[PDB]
Amino acid sequence: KETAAAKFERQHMDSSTSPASSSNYCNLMMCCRNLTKDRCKPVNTFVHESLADVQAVCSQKNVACKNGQTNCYQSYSTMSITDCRETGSSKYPNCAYKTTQANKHIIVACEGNPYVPVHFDASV
């Protein structure tokens, strides 16, 4: 008769392998979104909220962009994001990244009609 301990392991345990762990999210994603084809993009943030909520930021808190422009906007709320940045040993075409999941406000630059995000400026 299965023990209570083994029933729990059966119903609930699925330890991830190294290839499947979140720490490898950035390495897979920077590659599949084509951000490592020509050189290693040093830093890049992925945003996990809906597209509606991210597009909505273009009508939220207007802030200066790092480059000096003023078509940047910060979300009023924090958003689930994942920050990818090159590890010290990363070397093109073998780019490597440290994955950091977080909840932060995002700052995006907006342009066009409709006025939507066209550049990711910072997470704060």
Added chain:
Amino acid sequence: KETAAAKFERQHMDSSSNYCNLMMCCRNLTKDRCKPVNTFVHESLADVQAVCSQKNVACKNGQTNCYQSYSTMSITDCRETGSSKYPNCAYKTTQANKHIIVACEGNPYVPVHFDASV
């Protein structure tokens, strides 16, 4: 030419899979009925068993042998979809990082029930 808007979506959007459908079935949780909800923990077995030595808390049923993990653990919640119908069980998969609460018993003292994630 890919638009400026579409380029932003490619480099930066990753909003919100059949993981629950397969695991619920591989672990025999859909054998004669669809178990309605279940949670899988992706930490090592040793780290999960160590929770029985962490924060002692009351279980939902009032027992006093529940334990909450000091740290958040990577987990996946499996919830039956609205269309799910035995023998064609179907689940929505939601990943999270939360503290887990397990009831423990036995010698050695190990988890025997998943009570909640907080």
